[PDB]
C-alpha cells in the first residue's frame, strides 16, 4: 500500500497486482484504464531491474529512457537489448551474394507426415540466434570460380534486431571459410558505427556497404565450386548504452553492454520471430523454479509473445501488423529442452494449446511465419484461387473449413517462389465420419505422392517439398478426397536452402 | 496552478496552453503580444527535452543556448540538429596510382558542429574501395549552419590519408571505360557547446552521437531546397498509441512555418520572398507519408495538404519550382507566353488565364540543363466540362496524352526527360477545344 | 535600484543607462567623469556576456582579465578576439623534390592567443597539394596582439614536415615551371585563452578559442581598418531585428569605430594615431548587403553621413586610409605638388576650399607608386551655379577619358584606374574644368 522494498519508486502492492504510470507517477491498475490506451505492468517487488537490462522498472514503465528504445522494451518484463550481427555482401579474393538471418536454425529440421497428441511445433538440435548468418550466392551460373583466374577485403553491413540502439559498434568476426578459420579480424577505427538503432543498419540502406581491409587456398575454392557457400558470423560485439547525467545530458562513455549480457541471458527466455524478411529477437524475463524468493511474474507463451512483439489482440488471435501469428497460423520451432518441457506440461493441460504454457527460464522459441497462408475466413494471400472452394459451413478451425469432396488444386508460379529453397506444406485435416482417406500429390524436381487418414477432430499434417531453378516448372498441389473432408489453416512456409552442385 | 511536473522552469499549465518568455521568465501568452514582436510557444509538460535535443524547453524558448544556433530552432518543437555532409570538387589521380581528393564540408542544419570528423566511402560501381575518416589535419574546428569548411573564398582541403591504395589496373581501366567515382559519407563525429558550472563554454565531452537516434526517432523530417540552397529540419511529433505522450499536435503548414521561420502573408507563406504555399511549390513525399496523407484527406473536406496533422515518421520534400508564373507579377519562363488573358475576377489567387483555343510556347534549351528530368504542373478548371485538354511533348521520347477537366482547379503533373547538351530545342504546345481556365503553370527540376 | 537580472554584478538600471567602474564597484555615470578620464559603458541587462567572448561584462569593464588584452576590448560591446594568420617569407623548393617554407605567424586581433597551432593549405591554382598542421615544434607559446611569432628581429621558423611532402608527380609541377607560384592559405587556427582560477593563477589548458568563434562571429559585426603598413580587425556587438528580448544597445558607425579602435575625438574630427579617420578623410569599401542596407537607412536621413547609420549585426566594413592625401590645409604628400592652387576661400569642408585657377594637371612618376595594382582617384565636387563642365582624362594601360556634371552640393566622386606592368611609363592624369570650381579633399589610395 505504501511500502517500497527494492526502492524503485513503485510500491510493493502495486508491483505485485498491477500498476500503470499516469503523469509520471505510478497508480493502481483498474480495468477502466484499458479503453484509454493504458497498459498493465507487473514486475518483481524484490528487484529494481527485473529484466536484467540497465534501466529499472520505473525507468522502463514511465518511458524515461532514450526515445529510440522500442515501446515493447518499456515493459518491465522485456529487456532493452541489442542483437547486432554482421552480414557479407561482396568478397574479394567477385559477384554479389545474399544472406538469411534464420538459416542455421532451419537446416536441422525434420518434418514428419503427422504429429502427436497436442504438440504442434517442430524440434531443432541447432538453435542459433539471429546473429549467426550464412550467405547464399545468386549471380553464379554453376560454373567454377576458377573461370578467369584459376588460382592454384569484403563488403559488409552491420544490422540490429533488438529493442535498443547500440552506440560505438565494434564487432569481432571470424573468416571461417567453411570449417577452417584463418583470422579473427576486428573493426579497428574506420569500421565502428557511431550509432545503430533497432531495425536499422550501418551504413544505412541506400548507402554503399562498409569495407574491411585492415590467402585463400584451393580447398575452400573447390568447396565453393562444389556447392558450399561462404559463411560470416560474429563471435562478439562491443558497444555502449545511453544514460542521463547529473547535468541532464546523455552520456554513452563507460556504459558498456558487455557488463549486462551475461546477466540478461541468464534470466530471460529467448523468442525469435521471422516474417520472411524482417527478423526480430526478444528476451523476456522468467522466474527461477528453485528459488522461493524469486518474484518474477509468471506469464504464458502467448502472453510473452504479445508483450515482446507488441502484437494486437484482435478478439482472441494474435496479430502482428495484420499478419496472424497465432500458433495455429505459424510453425513454431523449439530446441530439445523446450520441446521436453512443453510436451510434459501439455499432459496436465485440458486446452492442449502451446500458447497456454507457462514461460520458463531458458526456453528457446522460433516463430516461422508462412509465406502464403489462407484460412477461408478473412485472410488469403495465396497468389491463386484453390479449385472447388466451399465456405457454407460453421465447422472450421476459426470460422469455416473447406468441404473437401473430390479434389482441390492450386497453381503456384515458380517465379513467385525462390529457387533452391526447402518448403513445408502444412494444414489441418479432420473427418467426423472417420471413414474416408486423403492422398496428396505434388510435382517438382522429384514427384512425391503421400496419403493420410483423417481423425474425428482437427489434427495438423505436414509434408515436405523442395524447389529448384529460378525459371522452371511450377508447383501444383492436389488434395484428392473420397468422401467429405474438412480442411482449414492451409499454408506453406519457407525453410532452409537446399544446396546444388 | 503553478505545478511543474517536468521541472524545467515552465509551469505545465503554461505549456498546455500558450506561453512566452519575458525578462527570462515564462509568462502566459496573450493575444496582444503578437504585434510587439513575440511568439507563442507550446511544449510537452512531461518531458524537459521535448524535441530530443540536448537543450531543454526553457533554454530553447528563452534563448539561453549557443548564439550560433539559429532562431529558426529556438522553438521547443524544432530540434537543434546539425546536418553535415562532404562533397568533392575535383579529383587528383596520379601515378600503381595514388588517389587524392579535394573536399569541402557542408552544413544545412540549425546548430553549429564543433570538431567535425566525417567518415566517407570511395565507390566507383558498387565495389567500395576504402573507408576514410578525417584523422588530424582535416578536422573542422567550427562549422556554423549554412556555412562550409573551408569557408567560402578558400581552396578546398586535400584528403590523401589512409596513402590511398587502389590496384594498378582494374580501377584505372574501369574509370577509363566511362565511369566516375563517388564520395558518400556514412557518419560524422562532432561536438556541441554547453556552458559549464562557471560559465565557460565547453565542447569536449558533449557529443552529437548520443542524440542522433533520439532526434531521428521522436520527430519527422522536412526538407526545403530552393535550387541554390538546401535546408534540413526535424520537428517533434507525438506518438499515436501512447496516451502519456503530451507533445502538441500541429499541422503540416504550421510545422513548415515553425521549422523555417517563414512569414505568413495571411495565407501565403514566404521564406525570403520566395513563395512556400502549397500551390506555388511541389511537395515530394515517400510512400508511408503518401498513404497517410491520402487516408487522412479522405476524412476531411478541406482537401489541403497543409491542413493535415503532422505525426511521427513522415518525410516531406519541398522542391521550389524554377520556372513558375502566376499571371500577376511572376514570369521566369525562357520564352514569352502566347494567347494570354489577364482579365479575370475569379482566379485561383487574384486572376486566372482565360485561354481561348491553344497556346504556342517554346522552351529554348540554352536556358535549360541536360541529363536532368523535369515536370510541368499547373491548375486546370473548366465548369463547362466540354473542352478537351491535350499536350504534346517534344523530348528524347515523344508522348501525347489527354486530360480530363474538372469543375474546380486540380493539379496535373507529367514527367519528361531531356538528355544531351548538343541536341535540339524542346517544345511543348498547349491545346484546348475552347475557352479554358488555367492558373499557376510551372516547371520544376527533379532528379 | 539593485535589480540584477543576469547576475553579473551590475544593476539593470545602470546597464540600460550609462555606468562606470570606480574602486571595482559599478557606479552610475555622471557627465563630469569625462574630465578625469573615465568612460561611459553600456551593455545588455539580459546577458552576462554581451559580446559573446569568454569574459563577462564586469570582467571587461573593470579590467579584471589578462593584461595583454587591448584596452579596446574593455568596452563590453567590443569582443576580445584574436585574428591570426600564417604569413610567408620564403618558398624553398629542394629537388625527387622537397618543399621548405619560412612562415611567420601574425596577430591583428584584440586578445592574445596561447599555444597557436594553425592549419594551412598548400595551393597553387585550384588544386591543393596537401593540408599541413603545425605538429609539435611549430607552435607559438605566446602571440600578443599586433605581434608576430617569431618576434620582430628574429628569423622565421622553418616549415617542412608532413611521411613527407613532395610535389605530386612529374605531370603537375610544370605548371609552376611555366611561371606560376604556390600560395599558403590558413583554413583555421587553434589556440587557448587565459582565465584566473580560484587560487589566483592563470590557466590556459582547458580553455579554447574555437569555442567562442561561432558565437562572436554570429553576434557581432566585423570592422577592419587599414593604415598602409598595419591592419586591424575588430568585432562590435549588435542586436537582432525582430527580437524584442534582445537588449543590446544600438550605436551608429561613428561611435562604433571610436569604441573599436579607441580613436580620440577632438570635438568633431576623429584621429586614431594622428591619422584622421573621418568619413571624408578615408574611403570605405563594403559588400553588397552592407551597402544596400546603409543606403536604405541613409535615404531616410537628411544628414546623409555614413557615420550616422545605426550599426547592425552582419555588417562588414573595410576602412582604407588614403596614402596620397591633401586638403590644402596642413598636409600634402604628393611627390609632385599640385599646380594652379589658391588657398583663399571660406566655403571649405572644414577650414578652406581650393580656388581652381582654370586647368590643373600634374604628372606623378612610378617611383612612389606600386605597380601592377589599381589605384583610385577620389575627391569632392560641387557647383553653386552648375555653369561649368568637368571632364577627366587619364593616360594608363587603356585610354581613360570620362566626363561628369558636378552637383550643387558637396558630392564625393570615385574614379578607378589600373596601372598594369612593373616597368610602366610615367602615368599621366589630367582634370579639365570649364571655369573656377571649389574643390577639397583630393585623395589617391592604393588598392
Ligand atoms: Ca518496488
Ligand atoms: Ca521492482
Ligand atoms: Ca478457417
Ligand atoms: Ca514544465
Ligand atoms: Ca517541458
Ligand atoms: Ca493567376
Ligand atoms: Ca546586470
Ligand atoms: Ca550585462
Ligand atoms: Ca578644408
Nearest CB to B102 within list C127, C133, C208: C127
What is the three-class DSSP state of A12?
helix
Which residues have CB under 8 Å from B394's CB, separation 6+? B426, B427, B428
Report whether the peptide linkage leading into residue A203 is cis, meaning its omega lies within 30 degrees of zero.
Answer: yes
Give the residues across from A440 on adjacent strands. A450, A479
Are residues B164 and B120 in contact, defined by beta-carbon separation less than 8 angstroms? Answer: no
Using the beta-carbon criterion (under 8 Å), do B128 and A251 form an inter-chain contact? Answer: no
Write out the DSSP string of C148-203. Answer: EESPTTSPPEEE--------S-TTTTHHHHTT---EEEEEEEEEE--EE-TTS-EE
Query: Measuring CA to CA, which residue among A120, A121, A131, A124 is closest to residue A107?
Result: A124
Q: Does A203 contact B at CB distance below 8 Å?
A: yes
Evaluate whether chains B and A are touching (3 or more beta carbon pairs less than 8 Å apart). yes
Whole-angstrom CA distances from B373 to B379, B426, B445 are 21, 13, 7
- Produce one character per residue of B340-353: b if its CB has 16 or more CB atoms within 10 Å, e if not: ebeeeeebbbebbb
Strands A459-466 and B157-159: what pairing?
A: unpaired
Are residues B116 and B139 in contact, defined by beta-carbon separation less than 8 angstroms? Answer: yes
- Which secondary-structure segment (H or E) carries C12? helix C12-16
Taking the C-alpha atoms of residue B396 and residue B424, their distance in angstroms, rounded to an integer, is: 10
- Produce one character per residue of A352-378: b if its CB has 16 or more CB atoms within 10 Å, e if not: ebbbbbebbbbbbbbbbbbbbbbbbee
* Residue C27 CB coordination number (10 Å): 14
3-state percent breakdown (helix, strand, coil) of chain B, nearest 5 = 15, 35, 50
Query: Measuring CA to CA, which residue among C238, C209, C210, C207 is closest to residue C222?
Result: C238
Whole-angstrom CA distances from B303 to B300, B412, B442 are 6, 15, 21
Q: Find out whether C15 is annotated in a ligand binding site.
A: yes
What is the three-class DSSP state of C48?
coil
Q: Name the residue with cell 538469411.
A: A100
Are residues C188 and B140 in contact, defined by beta-carbon separation less than 8 angstroms? Answer: yes
Query: Measuring CA to CA, which residue among B101, B66, B73 is closest to residue B87?
Result: B101
Q: Does C215 contact B at CB distance below 8 Å?
A: yes
A144: its cell numbers: 567454377
Taking the C-alpha atoms of residue C261 and residue C68, their distance in angstroms, rounded to an integer, is: 16
Q: Find out whether C44 is annotated in a ligand binding site.
A: yes
Helix and strand numbers (H, E) in chain A are 7, 29
B61: its cell numbers: 524558448
Q: Find out whether C47 is annotated in a ligand binding site.
A: yes
The count of residues in chain B is 447
Are residues B77 and B218 in contact, defined by beta-carbon separation less than 8 angstroms? Answer: no
Mutate to test the interface with A, among B214, B219, B241, B247 (most CBs of A within 10 A): B214
- Secondary structure letter of residue C350 according to DSSP: S
- Secondary structure letter of residue C222 according to DSSP: E
Mutate to test the interface with B, among A67, A75, A321 (most CBs of B within 10 A): A67
Q: Per residue, what are the HEC states of B13-36?
A: HHHHCCEEEECCEEEECCHHHCCC
Q: Does C219 contact B at CB distance below 8 Å?
A: yes
Whole-angstrom CA distances from B7 to A55, B249, C7, C156 are 21, 22, 22, 58
Give the residues across from B366 on adjacent strands. none
Taking the C-alpha atoms of residue B8 and residue A377, their distance in angstroms, rounded to an integer, is: 54
C367: its cell numbers: 617611383
Taking the C-alpha atoms of residue B314 and residue B294, their distance in angstroms, rounded to an integer, is: 13
Whole-angstrom CA distances from C317 to C111, C254, C311, C320 are 21, 12, 10, 10
- Secondary structure letter of residue C71 according to DSSP: G
Ligand nearest the Cα of residue A48 is 2
Are residues A86 and A234 in contact, defined by beta-carbon separation less than 8 angstroms? Answer: yes
Using the beta-carbon criterion (under 8 Å), do B211 and A23 form an inter-chain contact? Answer: no
Q: Find out whether B353 is annotated in a ligand binding site.
A: no
Using only C-alpha atoms, chain B has a radius of gyration, in whole angstroms, of 26
Evaluate whether chains C and A are touching (3 or more beta carbon pairs less than 8 Å apart). no
Are residues C51 and C79 in contact, defined by beta-carbon separation less than 8 angstroms? Answer: yes
Using the beta-carbon criterion (under 8 Å), do C119 and B137 form an inter-chain contact? Answer: yes
The CA-based dihedral angle spanning residues C26, C29, C34, C36, taken in that order and rounded to the nearest 10 degrees: -40
CB contacts of B46 in chain A (<8 Å) are 23-24
Taking the C-alpha atoms of residue A490 and residue A492, their distance in angstroms, rounded to an integer, is: 7
Taking the C-alpha atoms of residue B57 and residue B43, their distance in angstroms, rounded to an integer, is: 7
Q: Does A141 contact B at CB distance below 8 Å?
A: no
What is the three-class DSSP state of B292?
helix
What is the three-class DSSP state of C287?
coil
The count of residues in chain A is 501
* Residue B46 CB coordination number (10 Å): 19
Are residues C122 and C129 in contact, defined by beta-carbon separation less than 8 angstroms? Answer: yes
Using the beta-carbon criterion (under 8 Å), do C121 and B92 form an inter-chain contact? Answer: no
Q: Find out whether A103 is annotated in a ligand binding site.
A: no
Give B121 to chain A, closest Cα distance, Å.
8
Give the residues across from C14 on adjacent strands. none
Q: Find out whether C199 is annotated in a ligand binding site.
A: no
Q: Name the residue with cell 529487456.
A: A79
CB contacts of B156 in chain C (<8 Å) are 128
Report whether the peptide linkage leading into residue B150 is cis, meaning its omega lies within 30 degrees of zero.
Answer: yes
Q: Find out whether A57 is annotated in a ligand binding site.
A: yes
CB contacts of B37 in chain C (<8 Å) are 242-244
- Secondary structure letter of residue B78 according to DSSP: B
Q: Does B56 contact A at CB distance below 8 Å?
A: yes
Using the beta-carbon criterion (under 8 Å), do A67 and B54 form an inter-chain contact? Answer: no
Are residues C46 and C6 in contact, defined by beta-carbon separation less than 8 angstroms? Answer: yes
Taking the C-alpha atoms of residue C218 and residue A185, their distance in angstroms, rounded to an integer, is: 47
Give the residues across from C125 on adjacent strands. none
Cited resolution, angstroms? 3.3
Using the beta-carbon criterion (under 8 Å), do A207 and B216 form an inter-chain contact? Answer: no
Are residues C172 and C124 in contact, defined by beta-carbon separation less than 8 angstroms? Answer: no
Strands A438-443 and A402-404: what pairing?
A: unpaired
Please give the distance of CA B136 from its chain centroid, rounded to a whole number.
32
Neighbouring subunits of C (3+ Cβ pairs under 8 A)? B
Q: Does C214 contact B at CB distance below 8 Å?
A: yes
Q: Does C404 contact B at CB distance below 8 Å?
A: no
Please give the distance of CA C153 from its chain centroid, rounded to a whole number.
26
Strands A122-123 and A331-334: what pairing?
A: parallel
Nearest CB to C133 within list B71, B112, B137: B137
CB contacts of B100 in chain C (<8 Å) are 168
Q: Does B264 contact C at CB distance below 8 Å?
A: no
Helices (H), B156-251: 170-176, 212-217
Taking the C-alpha atoms of residue C104 and residue C138, their distance in angstroms, rounded to an integer, is: 10
Taking the C-alpha atoms of residue C446 and residue A297, their distance in angstroms, rounded to an integer, is: 87
Write out the DSSP string of A113-181. Answer: S---SS--SEEBS----TT-EEE---S--S--TTSS-----EEEEEEE-SSS--EEEEEEEE--TTT--
Query: Measuring CA to CA, which residue among B440, B385, B388 is closest to residue B413?
Result: B440
* Residue A81 CB coordination number (10 Å): 28
Mutate to test the interface with B, among A24, A33, A194 (most CBs of B within 10 A): A194
Are residues B111 and B80 in contact, defined by beta-carbon separation less than 8 angstroms? Answer: yes
Query: Measuring CA to CA, which residue among A384, A282, A380, A373 is closest to residue A330?
Result: A373
Ligand nearest the Cα of residue B47 is 5
Q: Find out whether C352 is annotated in a ligand binding site.
A: yes
| Beta strands in B29-109, from DSSP E residues, in sequence order | 84-94, 98-107
A400 C-alpha to center of ligand 9: Å? Answer: 109
Query: Measuring CA to CA, which residue among C150, C152, C141, C69 is closest to residue C105?
Result: C150
Using the beta-carbon criterion (under 8 Å), do B140 and C54 form an inter-chain contact? Answer: no
Query: Residue B251, by phi and psi: left (phi above 0), alpha (psi -120 to 50) or beta?
Result: beta
Are residues A360 and A319 in contact, defined by beta-carbon separation less than 8 angstroms? Answer: no
Put the strands of the sheet holding B128-133 in their side by side order.
B128-133, B114-123, B182-191
* Residue C224 CB coordination number (10 Å): 17
Ligand nearest the Cα of residue B439 is 6
B441: its cell numbers: 503553370
Query: Measuring CA to CA, which residue among C226, C222, C224 is closest to residue C237?
Result: C222
Are residues C407 and C387 in contact, defined by beta-carbon separation less than 8 angstroms? Answer: no
Q: Which residue of chain C has the CA closest to B151?
A: C187
Q: Name the residue with cell 511568439.
A: B39
Are residues B409 and B344 in contact, defined by beta-carbon separation less than 8 angstroms? Answer: no
Are residues B102 and B159 in contact, defined by beta-carbon separation less than 8 angstroms? Answer: yes
Give the residues across from B268 on adjacent strands. B265
CA end-to-end distance (rounded Å), chain A? 70
Write out the DSSP string of B293-328. Answer: HHHHHTT-SS--GGGSBP-TT-EEEEE--SEE--SS
Write out the DSSP string of B232-264. Answer: EEEEE---SS-TT--PPP-BHHHHHHHHHTPEE
Helices (H), A331-390: 336-346
Which residues have CB under 8 Å from B265's CB, separation 6+? none
Q: Does B150 contact C at CB distance below 8 Å?
A: yes
* Residue B292 CB coordination number (10 Å): 17
Nearest CB to C219 within list B67, B71, B204: B67
Please give the distance of CA A331 from its chain centroid, rounded to a whole number.
10
Query: Measuring CA to CA, which residue among A480, A344, A328, A348 is closest to residue A404?
Result: A480
- Collect residues with CB below 5 Å from ion ligand 7: C 4, 6, 8, 10
**Which residues does chain C break after (C to N > 2.5 Å)?**
95, 162
Amino acid at each position: 500500500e505504501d511500502l517500497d522494498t527494492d526502492n524503485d519508486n513503485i510500491p510493493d502492492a502495486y508491483e505485485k497486482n498491477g500498476y500503470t504510470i499516469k503523469d509520471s507517477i505510478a497508480v493502481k491498475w483498474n480495468d477502466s484504464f484499458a479503453e484509454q490506451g493504458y497498459k498493465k505492468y507487473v514486475s518483481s517487488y524484490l528487484e529494481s531491474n527485473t529484466a536484467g537490462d540497465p534501466y529499472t522498472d520505473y525507468q522502463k514503465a514511465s518511458g524515461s529512457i532514450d526515445k529510440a528504445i522500442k515501446l515493447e522494451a518499456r515493459d518491465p518484463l522485456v529487456a532493452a537489448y541489442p542483437v547486432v550481427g554482421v552480414g557479407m555482401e561482396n568478397l574479394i579474393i567477385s559477384r554479389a551474394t545474399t544472406n538469411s538471418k534464420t538459416d542455421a536454425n532451419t537446416v536441422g529440421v525434420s518434418i514428419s507426415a503427422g504429429y502427436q497428441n497436442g504438440f504442434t511445433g517442430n524440434i531443432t538440435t541447432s538453435y542459433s540466434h539471429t546473429t549467426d548468418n550464412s550467405t547464399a550466392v545468386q549471380d553464379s551460373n554453376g560454373e567454377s570460380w576458377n573461370t578467369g583466374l584459376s588460382i592454384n577485403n569484403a563488403n559488409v553491413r552491420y544490422y540490429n534486431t533488438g529493442t535498443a540502439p547500440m552506440y560505438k559498434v565494434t564487432p569481432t568476426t571470424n573468416l571461417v571459410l567453411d570449417g577452417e578459420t584463418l583470422a579473427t579480424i576486428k573493426a579497428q577505427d574506420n569500421q565502428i558505427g557511431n550509432n545503430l538503432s533497432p531495425n536499422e543498419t550501418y551504413p544505412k540502406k541506400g548507402l554503399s556497404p562498409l569495407a574491411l581491409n585492415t590467402p585463400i587456398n584451393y580447398d575452400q575454392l573447390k568447396k565453393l565450386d562444389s556447392g558450399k557457400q561462404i559463411k560470416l558470423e560474429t563471435t562478439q560485439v562491443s558497444g555502449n548504452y545511453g544514460t542521463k547525467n547529473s547535468q541532464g545530458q546523455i552520456i554513452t562513455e563507460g556504459n558498456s553492454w558487455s557488463n549486462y549480457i551475461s546477466q540478461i541471458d541468464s534470466v530471460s527466455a529467448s523468442i525469435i520471430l521471422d516474417t520472411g524478411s524482417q527478423t526480430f529477437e526478444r528476451r523476456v524475463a522468467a522466474k527461477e523454479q528453485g528459488n522461493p524468493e524469486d518474484k518474477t511474474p509468471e506469464i504464458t507463451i502467448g502472453e510473452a509473445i504479445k508483450k515482446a512483439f507488441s502484437a494486437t489482440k484482435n478478439g482472441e488471435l494474435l496479430y502482428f501488423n495484420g499478419i496472424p501469428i497465432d500458433e495455429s497460423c505459424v510453425e513454431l520451432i523449439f530446441d530439445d529442452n523446450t520441446s521436453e518441457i512443453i510436451k510434459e506440461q501439455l499432459k496436465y493441460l485440458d486446452d492442449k494449446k502451446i500458447y497456454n504454457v507457462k514461460l520458463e527460464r531458458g526456453m528457446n522459441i522460433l516463430i516461422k511465419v508462412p509465406s502464403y497462408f489462407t484460412n477461408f475466413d478473412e485472410y488469403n494471400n495465396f497468389p491463386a484461387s484453390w479449385s472447388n472452394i466451399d465456405t457454407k459451413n460453421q465447422d472450421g478451425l476459426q470460422s469455416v473449413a473447406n468441404k473437401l469432396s473430390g479434389e482441390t488444386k492450386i497453381i503456384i508460379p515458380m517465379s513467385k517462389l525462390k529457387p533452391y529453397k526447402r518448403y513445408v506444406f502444412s494444414g489441418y485435416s479432420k473427418d467426423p465420419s472417420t471413414s474416408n482417406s486423403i492422398t496428396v500429390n505434388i510435382k517438382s524436381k522429384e514427384q512425391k505422392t503421400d496419403y493420410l487418414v483423417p481423425e474425428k477432430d482437427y489434427t495438423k499434417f505436414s509434408y515436405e517439398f523442395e524447389t529448384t531453378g529460378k525459371d522452371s516448372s511450377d508447383i501444383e498441389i492436389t488434395l484428392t478426397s473420397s468422401g467429405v473432408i474438412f480442411l482449414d489453416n492451409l499454408s506453406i512456409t519457407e525453410l532452409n536452402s537446399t544446396p546444388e552442385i
